[PDB]
Write a protein that binds this ligand. Structure first.
Ligand code: AKG
Ligand code: MN
Ligand code: ZN
Length: 304
């Protein structure tokens, strides 16, 4: 979906314009970094770099040079602002155009309970102990169980209705200014459906992405309980992109804030600790999302 959903039509014959994948601004690729490369094949008439996009567009003076770029730059590697290693992929385009999408609701199933605990309770939970610690649990070897300070809050949560499935497994995640968790999807054949995460410490933004291309950055405020179930916990994937700052609604909002709707400002994330509670399931899964399911992808070598 690197460019299919994006509405980027590609052709199989050499043209003056190309499409550099992963060579975009929304990928930490600097113009002072990409251009010096692209010009290693010929005269570059223009270098289009749309904001918040994982790709850019390059046009050469003549298709001869543009053709040389397609053949000597595919597979090439470059360093982003983080200093990581990303692979560049080029392709010929007959028109420079793309699709802009702005989601208007959190992924189906995802819910965000705000101000679940008071400022005092937060301080407590914090002082009760990237770094990671497991509790409850390899669904065969388990431990004494979840701590007492948690068994309560949990009961209080399900007493209300914020969650209707008492967990038994917990994972502690503490992030420091710059850390983050790589996009993933909790194993289907492991933990039950409903999953909740209590985020304390400081604000942070998560990246939920639909398998087709719909990306939705959620805003997880302090003392808030992230509750994801259904399509959001099975199909969509979440993550935390490494960084020390991140765009936010320059106004009030625990949720999805898109661009071109008002004002944007920056915010530095501090120390963030999260309590992710899950419920291990004994039975195999049979959700409506077999493609991202290993419990279902096992009854057929095709997928394996
Ligand atoms: O929201 C968090 O940071 C914790 C949930 C999570 O993605 C995990 O630890 O698998
Ligand atoms: Mn997870
Ligand atoms: Zn499944």
């Amino acid at each position: 979906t690197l460019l299919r959903h994006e509405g980027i039509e590609t052709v199989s014959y050499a043209t003056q314009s190309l499409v550099v994948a992963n060579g975009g601004l929304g990928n930490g690729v600097s113009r002072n970094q990409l251009l010096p490369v692209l010009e290693k094949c010929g005269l570059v008439d223009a270098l289009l770099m749309p904001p918040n996009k994982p790709y850019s567009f390059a046009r050469y003076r003549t298709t001869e040079e543009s053709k040389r770029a397609y053949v000597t730059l595919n597979g090439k590697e470059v360093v982003d602002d983080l200093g990581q290693k990303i692979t560049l992929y080029l392709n010929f385009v007959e028109k420079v155009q793309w699709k802009e999408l702005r989601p208007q609701a959190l992924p189906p199933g995802l819910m965000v309970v705000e101000e679940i605990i008071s400022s005092e309770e937060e301080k407590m939970l914090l002082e009760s102990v990237r770094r990671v610690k497991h509790f409850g649990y390899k669904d065969k070897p388990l431990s004494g169980g979840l701590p007492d300070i948690c068994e309560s809050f949990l009961e209080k949560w399900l007493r209300k209705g914020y969650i209707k499935h008492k967990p038994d497994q917990m994972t502690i995640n503490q992030y420091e200014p710059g850390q983050g968790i790589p996009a993933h999807i909790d194993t289907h054949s492991a933990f039950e459906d409903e999953i909740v995460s209590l985020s304390l410490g400081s604000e942070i933004v998560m990246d939920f992405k639909h398998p087709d291309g719909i990306a939705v950055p959620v805003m997880l405020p302090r003392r808030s309980l992230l509750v994801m179930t259904g399509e959001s916990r099975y199909l969509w994937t979440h993550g935390i992109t490494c960084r020390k700052f991140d765009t936010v609604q320059a106004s009030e909002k625990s949720g999805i804030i898109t661009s071109d709707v008002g004002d944007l400002t920056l915010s530095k994330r501090g120390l963030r600790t999260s309590f992710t509670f899950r419920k291990v399931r004994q039975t195999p899964c049979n959700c409506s999302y077999p493609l991202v399911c290993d419990s279902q992808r096992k009854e057929n070598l095709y997928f394996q």
